[PDB]
């Protein structure tokens, strides 16, 4: 029933949902893990922020074709993520309000992770990095 003109319309694969844990495949943060927060209003990129104290990835935009979405999911009902908006990236040494937004989001995200029964294992999991060793076959894996 959703129309293409409506903002809520989107065509992204069903594995990429809020709270999903993804592996970054390209960029300066290649091989690191992060958490998908939301999607931009139109059919735009996703916004990811792995807890910056865990993996070192700040709030950023990323295309859905450059992340591998795993099956591990953290409940995100508590985190509002309403402050995330296209204008924060539209504006062109970090700024004060950007730091405040990052701190607020990280605090809520960390509490949600610890709420999971495997909270400690999840925190260690977010620390790990992914790499292709000699003799690996990523096409045979399940994720």
């Amino acid at each position: 029933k959703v129309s293409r003109k409506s903002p809520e319309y989107s065509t992204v694969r069903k594995s990429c949902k809020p709270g999903t844990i993804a592996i970054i495949l390209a960029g300066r943060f290649r091989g690191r893990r992060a958490v998908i927060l939301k999607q931009l209003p139109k059919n735009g990129p996703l916004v990811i922020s792995g807890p910056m104290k865990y993996s070192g990835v700040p709030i950023r935009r990323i295309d859905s074709r450059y992340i591998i979405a795993t099956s591990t999911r953290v409940d995100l009902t508590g985190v509002d993520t309403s402050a995330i908006t296209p204008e924060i990236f539209k504006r062109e040494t970090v700024s004060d309000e950007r730091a405040q937004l990052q701190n607020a989001i990280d605090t809520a995200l960390i509490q949600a992770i610890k709420k999971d029964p495997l909270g400690k294992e999840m925190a260690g999991y977010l620390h790990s990095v992914f790499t292709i060793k000699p003799g690996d076959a990523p096409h045979r894996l399940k994720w």
Binding site: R13, L25, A26, R65, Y66, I68
Partner: protein, 99 residues
């Protein structure tokens, strides 16, 4: 037996050895890395001066599997890959990802 056509190239990837395995890599981006002999323009030549070098890359994509043993067919955008690359390393990246 009549000759070769240089508009398509064949790439052998490690640990594939099967047509069903090669189907996982259809549509992935590949590149051939080499070097010249003087520094020329590159991406982010002004934003990231540390990238300037003699290194160069030629990009392409995987189109379809070849044979029954994991070999794949690659087209390098709008031109051929130079024949000096025969027997050298080719990088096969994991994007665009369907997973």
């Amino acid at each position: 037996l009549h000759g070769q056509n240089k508009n398509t190239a064949l790439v052998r990837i490690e640990n594939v050895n099967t047509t069903e395995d090669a189907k996982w890599y259809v549509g992935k981006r590949v590149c051939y890395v080499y070097h010249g002999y003087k520094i020329k323009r590159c991406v982010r030549w002004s934003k990231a001066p540390a990238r300037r070098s003699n290194t160069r890359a030629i990009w392409g994509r995987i189109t379809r599997p070849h044979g029954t043993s994991g070999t794949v067919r690659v087209k390098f955008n709008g031109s051929s890959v130079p024949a000096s690359a025969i027997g050298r390393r080719i990088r096969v990246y994991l994007y665009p990802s369907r997973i």
